[PDB]
Design an enzyme around this catalytic site. Structure first.
Site, PDB file in Angstrom:
ATOM      1  N   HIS B 117       3.530   3.295   0.184  1.00 39.83           N
ATOM      2  CA  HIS B 117       3.788   2.771  -1.147  1.00 39.83           C
ATOM      3  C   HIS B 117       4.605   1.490  -1.039  1.00 39.83           C
ATOM      4  O   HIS B 117       5.478   1.348  -0.177  1.00 39.83           O
ATOM      5  CB  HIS B 117       4.515   3.807  -2.012  1.00 39.83           C
ATOM      6  CG  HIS B 117       4.538   3.464  -3.468  1.00 39.83           C
ATOM      7  ND1 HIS B 117       3.650   4.004  -4.375  1.00 39.83           N
ATOM      8  CD2 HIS B 117       5.333   2.626  -4.173  1.00 39.83           C
ATOM      9  CE1 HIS B 117       3.898   3.511  -5.576  1.00 39.83           C
ATOM     10  NE2 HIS B 117       4.917   2.676  -5.480  1.00 39.83           N
ATOM     11  N   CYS B 118       4.309   0.549  -1.928  1.00 36.31           N
ATOM     12  CA  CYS B 118       4.925  -0.770  -1.876  1.00 36.31           C
ATOM     13  C   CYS B 118       4.889  -1.409  -3.258  1.00 36.31           C
ATOM     14  O   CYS B 118       3.919  -1.221  -4.004  1.00 36.31           O
ATOM     15  CB  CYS B 118       4.205  -1.645  -0.845  1.00 36.31           C
ATOM     16  SG  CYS B 118       4.836  -3.326  -0.651  1.00 36.31           S
ATOM     17  N   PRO B 119       5.923  -2.154  -3.649  1.00 33.43           N
ATOM     18  CA  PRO B 119       5.894  -2.808  -4.963  1.00 33.43           C
ATOM     19  C   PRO B 119       5.026  -4.056  -4.972  1.00 33.43           C
ATOM     20  O   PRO B 119       4.557  -4.482  -6.032  1.00 33.43           O
ATOM     21  CB  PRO B 119       7.368  -3.140  -5.216  1.00 33.43           C
ATOM     22  CG  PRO B 119       7.928  -3.350  -3.852  1.00 33.43           C
ATOM     23  CD  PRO B 119       7.196  -2.390  -2.944  1.00 33.43           C
TER      24      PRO B 119
END
Ligand SMILES: [Zn+2]
Ligand SMILES: [Zn+2]
Lengths: 120, 249
Positions: B117-119
């Site tokens: 997960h990553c912004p």
């Protein structure tokens, strides 16, 4: 329309992560559905999902065509897995209307359950 | 809120406005193939990775699976390929988490086959968008490599003076590529390793698998085949709802 209970079939995992269910007949379904026809329907459904997964030349070709056309072919044409889902949906409807309904059973599409457990 | 990487597009458009129009009278004729197709591929893959369901499981409601759990430690073991894997009784998602998938914590959802997960991607990578993200990274690092290795013609053939006007346009993109290439190249090589092995991200984080590990290692070429040319999965959420048939006795 009284309801008695629900039985879940776990996915077969000895083969791996592929979408085949545990064909082993659960003991709760005794005298409601025989072992033979349940074996038959689970085997056919697993065959259908396996056919939806096959890494044949056609899958390579559709992947190449999608890559070349910037994947807009998905918008114009449904994917192979989707048409297999349509066919297996037709299969489960006809099976339910021909065998399970007189036996007081009904089957739901596992895609509603996320291809984890089939609910009877 | 969260924002994407606007600056990366801003570096590319320097080449689009004025970097090499009308230079191909005595040099390399075929201009667009170097950068234009790469930019279109990068944009398409990046967009399809950003806005797409990555494999959100359909939030299994209550009365799910088996309720005979009295004081179980909330994990049942399955031995795939003869090797056991420990999965978890997820609390809010309310199902057993089939092998090789997990929660996402911040994303607040529990998904299918999980990578990271990553912004910047604004989401978590499942397997529906894993192919799209992988080609996005490969095309982006290809774009950066192509810039820094061949698009420098506009200086390399250009004599000492290179005096202003349009040279300052190329001035900044060189250092942008220099500063951005090492991280993206390292990260895409990382994901290349994660594709070569049947083993990804959180599985790297787990410093415990020693021995008969990676049950789903498959055969390298088979992994690249399934991640590149396999038929895309369909969405597990939001499918139209059917209707009942009869009272059924
Ligand atoms: Zn969860
Ligand atoms: Zn997420």
């Amino acid at each position: 329309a009284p309801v008695s209970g629900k039985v879940f079939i776990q996915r077969d995992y000895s083969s791996g992560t592929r979408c085949q269910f545990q064909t082993k007949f659960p003991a709760e379904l005794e005298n409601r559905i025989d072992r033979q026809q349940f074996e038959e329907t689970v085997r056919t459904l697993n065959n259908l999902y396996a056919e939806a997964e096959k890494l044949g030349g056609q899958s390579y070709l559709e992947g190449c065509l999608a890559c070349l056309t910037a994947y807009t072919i998905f918008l114009c044409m449904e994917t192979h897995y989707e048409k297999v889902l349509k066919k297996v949906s037709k299969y489960i409807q006809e099976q339910n209307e021909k065998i399970y309904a007189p036996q007081g059973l009904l089957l739901t599409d596992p895609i509603e359950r996320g291809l984890r457990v089939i609910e009877i | 809120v969260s924002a994407a990487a606007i600056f990366l597009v801003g570096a590319t458009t320097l080449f689009f406005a004025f970097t090499c129009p009308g230079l191909s009278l005595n040099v390399s004729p075929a201009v667009p193939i170097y950068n234009a197709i790469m930019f279109l591929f990068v944009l398409a893959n990046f967009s399809m990775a950003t806005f797409m369901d990555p494999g959100i499981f359909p939030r299994a409601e209550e009365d799910e699976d088996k309720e005979d759990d009295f004081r179980a430690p909330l994990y049942k073991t399955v031995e795939i390929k003869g090797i056991q894997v420990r999965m978890k009784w997820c609390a809010t998602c309310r199902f057993y988490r089939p092998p090789r998938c997990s929660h996402c914590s911040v994303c607040d959802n529990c998904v299918e086959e999980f990578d990271h997960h990553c912004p910047w991607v604004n989401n978590c990578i499942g397997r529906r968008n894993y192919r799209y993200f992988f080609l996005f990274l490969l095309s982006l690092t290809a774009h950066i490599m192509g810039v820094f290795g061949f698009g420098l013609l506009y200086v390399l053939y250009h004599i000492e003076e290179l005096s202003g006007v349009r040279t300052a346009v190329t001035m900044a993109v060189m250092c942008v590529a220099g500063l951005f290439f090492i991280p993206v190249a390292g990260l895409t090589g990382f994901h290349v390793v994660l594709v070569a092995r049947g083993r990804t991200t959180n599985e790297q984080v787990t410093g415990k698998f020693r021995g008969g590990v990676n049950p789903f290692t498959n055969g390298c070429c088979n992994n690249v085949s399934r991640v590149l040319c396999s038929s895309p999965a369909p969405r597990y959420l939001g499918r139209p709802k059917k209707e009942k048939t009869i009272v059924i006795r």
